């Protein structure tokens, strides 16, 4: 008898909770778990590190997915294979509204620009990348109760981090179209969610200013403390939803 695991994340159905918090950095999993009530280390294969969190009485996984849409898609498909019903991406982003949203600001995302490939391999470009509206609402509610100021908006999910010389990026064009922030994974998660009837959402902390003006600190110590707040919102939200899902 074997524990029958998913190929890449190496988790079984039985280890997989209804609710899963996903992060990009495997190093983020260890930081998240220290803020929980208790945890159980599960698996660490490739970039896919898995813990069971207990937080505010509730069990849910935290799982790292790596950088970028194709790599994270493998994580997300395998979690959904294992029965996940709710997946929330918690991460860093760049601000596309640099006068309004600065380093440290937190953005809760209802939808995303699909500048990947894998979503297009699932379904036609016309199809919207959209959060589940209960998951989005819950993140907002929790942030309000914790008195943590948040922005809401669309994310640009772009497979390109480093620009080349020949053709422009769409960072400015999407800023003009009122897209809030930019990162690399949430469109892929949202589309796959809708397609597989798994509820998804996204919360992000601004740690990058890819347009222009401002700041610092270089990174990824992100920012402290504003970072803690975003993680707490994430954990509180995951707990509230795992209650729905017993």
């Amino acid at each position: 008898m074997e524990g029958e695991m998913q190929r890449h994340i190496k988790l079984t159905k039985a280890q997989t909770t209804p609710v899963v918090l996903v992060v990009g950095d495997p190093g983020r999993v260890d930081k998240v778990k220290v803020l929980c009530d208790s945890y159980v280390d599960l698996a660490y294969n490739r970039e896919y590190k898995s813990v069971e969190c207990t937080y505010k009485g509730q069990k849910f996984l935290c799982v790292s997915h790596g950088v970028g849409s194709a790599g994270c898609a493998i994580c997300f498909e395998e979690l959904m294979n294992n029965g996940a019903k709710v997946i929330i991406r918690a991460g860093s982003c760049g601000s596309l509204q640099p006068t309004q949203m600065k380093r440290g600001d937190i953005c809760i995302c209802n939808a995303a620009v699909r500048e990947d490939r894998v979503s297009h391999l699932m379904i036609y470009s016309d199809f919207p990348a959209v959060a589940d509206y209960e998951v989005y609402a819950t993140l907002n509610q929790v942030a309000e109760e914790l008195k943590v100021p948040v922005f809401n908006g669309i994310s640009l999910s772009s497979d390109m981090y480093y620009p080349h010389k020949i053709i422009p990026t769409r960072l400015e064009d999407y800023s003009k179209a009122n897209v809030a922030v930019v990162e690399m994974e949430v469109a892929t998660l949202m589309v796959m969610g809708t397609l597989r009837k798994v509820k998804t959402g996204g919360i992000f902390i601004v740690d990058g200013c890819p347009l222009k003006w401002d700041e610092g600190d270089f990174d990824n110590n992100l920012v402290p403390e504003r970072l803690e707040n975003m993680i707490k919102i994430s954990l509180e939200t995951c707990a509230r939803l795992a209650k729905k899902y017993l």
Copy 2:
């Protein structure tokens, strides 16, 4: 001195309320207005019929936009030109989930498939067609308070009503992708909304079964009564939002 009107809808800024309810049929405007507390007929040009509704103490317009994305886009741009802050499309749709959603069922829509052209003339296909999440939430809340059962889902907004022989439609493909309903305008409204910082949403009554099995009654007497309920939700929602917008 002239009252300075928008070219097609023939309304002035001063006549345009923060909240506007949009319908496809100019004949629907007259049906909506009879369910209000009071109304003022405004203008009727081309397919664009305009009334000011008073309902539950609040003023907001009801405006017809005609069939199809390019024609309704003219309506919507001109309303936004005049200062509309909230536009809600209330209409008929076909069911893409015919085992689950039948004639008479009401669907409140958070997002849409962009099978138009004009949204693509505004912004790249990758960009999501998405409702404002406050508008979506308010429609749901009102429906719950009125004890009217509702579905939630994505709409396919397709410029094609009558299929041709050569290439398939994507009606089945989008059904498989868990798209709830199909109509012809809401993607165009949602994208333009996001682009112009105008809050939008969509509520629809199933009056068509474009896949296959079922029913009737032919149309558009729609259905009575279930129709009344959808209109009431619309009107109640518009009132609740116009309160926010004094």
Copy 3:
């Protein structure tokens, strides 16, 4: 026993003549009909107003189709469903050759740029939007006999009326490509025509200068008189063709 009607235009086969004149504005139907020998009001549903014209001994319909490709496509499919053999669009346009074609000038169109969606839902982009060459020839002949000066050229049929900020329109690019005028429907009509073996064409009066320089009068009183001439050419052409079609 019912008179079995098309869903949107509400006309029966028996009411539908071989030749149909289509206009955008339902208000235009009433203006056209006053210039005929006699008429019979048929139906008025949504933006679709229908009259039978008698002009110079011949019977043919005048039918309004509303603004924009998806809405007019419903009109045109339903007319073709009812046996129409010839459909001519008579309308307003903008000049893309503003030094050459001014307000009041009339353009008879042999082909169009397909900047819609619905034609692309019928057939691949490579396929030409083209008038029937008998219909085009007849409009020219009638104009010559009536000593009304006309231009000939390609129309840009664009689903976008109001530009957005992010991506350019192709109005200038198509001007450089020697496209004469711009409107919103005739490409859709032409493609559907070819596909369904229905003869089509387009005549337009310049009432807009969307590039730049010039003029006036704002609109849509169009222009008088030059407007009358375009309508007369339309009516004379429809009569000449209905003779072919007894």
Copy 4:
């Protein structure tokens, strides 16, 4: 002092008539010229063979362009560079309506499907490939006077002659869309014509049945005699138009 020639066809402005008949096969130039009143051999470089025809009192060139859109485009650009005002393609095609149009039948073409690349390098796919309507009308008129039965229709201009195994051709799809015939050059000519204000058209003899059923004779002796008729129509048309162009 040099006679300043175009790079590929090696003709000067002074040698280039307002009207030019173009054929694919350089061997066709020699066959055409024997049916004229008199000729002057001009140049033969690469696949580009050039003669001045005199026919029915009028001078015009016959020029070979080779097989396929990119090669013929070089011919056509260089002729237009030299002042050609009218270019007519006279050639062979396959029947896409094999019940209606058989080997030997002649088709006069008003428009074409753009299944090339070079037209797309000139202008967006939405733009129609269309004959000048005077050139099309003249071919028809001449055929009628010569009592030669002709078909009229759209041509599929396809860069692919030999199909591969992986993706289908659009031969059947375009047959279903009522495209008459298939060849390899006329879309490219038509678009370039419109773009450069040069009047174009196409007449073709069915020598191929690429769908299926029928026939023979293998080719390219084409067919005799029906072939002569198509060439005569071509020559007569070229003469009639060169008269317009003194």
Copy 5:
């Protein structure tokens, strides 16, 4: 004074050798390094694990890049930022020629299908994904000297691992087009290489049969021994090239 590192891989220019071997699995770095003469652990951040290999007298890095095109692109851009002149991807693949290439077989790749997004964000789809031909030649030469049988061919680089229900994958289509193997990263590497004047190539071991028939062993213990051979070829090749690059 800081050692100035690349953001994600956390390596400095001074730590970065002209030649770099890239692998997907950070666990593969530890397996590679045990087969070298000596090593120096450098950095481990996110999925990016870095060692300096010494093998056969020569120094070159081995660096993990994670699963999938967008994540690995960050690795590759940062290595090129640091002066890498040669990057070779050594990994696992699936066989697209399952009668010819089986589990354990090794394929040296000269080119790839670009089924990513990020390469398309760099340059137009028309642009070829191609290995440097010296790097490809060297891998072949080394394999021949080591008497290790190898296949040569094109790789399909696909961002999709798990298929969805709505639209087909192109795995079969590309098999029919004589594509050898399928993996997820090498197209992205090849294009970026050409664009930045960095020499690239790919060697892969078949550990997957995504079409159909065959086998086993499940994975990723890959296969032993055939795996060792592929790694040895990789290491020998890297050494031979680092000699060129002192």
Copy 6:
């Protein structure tokens, strides 16, 4: 009994050697053949002129294909139909690296940009246009032995020779992407090769400076002597490969 020929090139299987040298200009065939040991004129139909070369003891064809991708594709498909195993394109090109590669310089090409249509009619754009690496290697080896300096690089294969006014060419963009040279046929050959398991490659002499600066001599006397060298490399390479293929 007939010698059963391919439709356009008019060659039989028995006349077709394993190795074929292809040139654009039928006039080039006569120039090539004079540099061989002996030849046999085979066929001359349309732009397709065919000779059997004997050079350095070996037999292989030289065949002209005309200008441009669709016309040459017919040549290449028919040669492959007849059993050709190796086809090498030898021709002229323009320099896209005008500081580095000048008139007279010779470029041996491993890959190409697919700016045709016919390759896209065979297979999806993502698929690479790539030379066989043995053919590429052999051209290089022969050039080295003959002490003829050569460049190596990617070719832009573009169906457009004469630019139009509306949309830019990609000549500069591809120069920035490190594409070496530009011509009109080799991408089409490479893709078809891979698809049909026929080994291909390309060698070119710079006779054009389509960017800008420089030179002369106008053309196509190309250049002497540097031209002879490129032809000799071609012939030597063809001989070396025909030896492999007895």
